[PDB]
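Contributing new complexes? Match this layout with A1L7S.
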Amino acid sequence: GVQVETISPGDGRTFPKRGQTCVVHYTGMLEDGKKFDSSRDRNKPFKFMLGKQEVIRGWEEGVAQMSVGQRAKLTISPDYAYGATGHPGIIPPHATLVFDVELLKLE
Ligand SMILES: COc1ccc(CCCc2noc([C@@H]3CCCCN3S(=O)(=O)C3CCCCC3)n2)cc1OC
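Output block (do not edit by hand):
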């Protein structure tokens, strides 16, 4: 599934609810540290809404455990990521993913 390890704590009180928009910054890496994507590189947070199949499952469950202000490492098994297909040219088949995620805001 998904493991969450805190890099810097959030407020411990403001957690994402079903149907809220999560605003984050992330960097995604393969297990060997190779970077496959980063919102920080584009100077523009990523947004998604819980409960709408908008993100891979490990994000849905992992970001849901975070509170506003938290920065965490999410380690996601391929069943909870891109599985056998991967993402063409970017994420290989059967890849465990590591994300550095910061939950900036709920809208
Ligand atoms: C619940 O499962 C599914 C539900 C929905 C889909 C559609 C795609 C949703 C999605 N798009 O991006 C992503 C992830 C996580 C959010 C940040 C962006 N990334 S990312 O890992 O960095 C990715 C890497 C390849 C290049 C594009 C960015 N999730 C797929 C699902 O499973 C395969």
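Reviewers usually confirm one structural detail per submission. For this one: Helices lie at 57-64.
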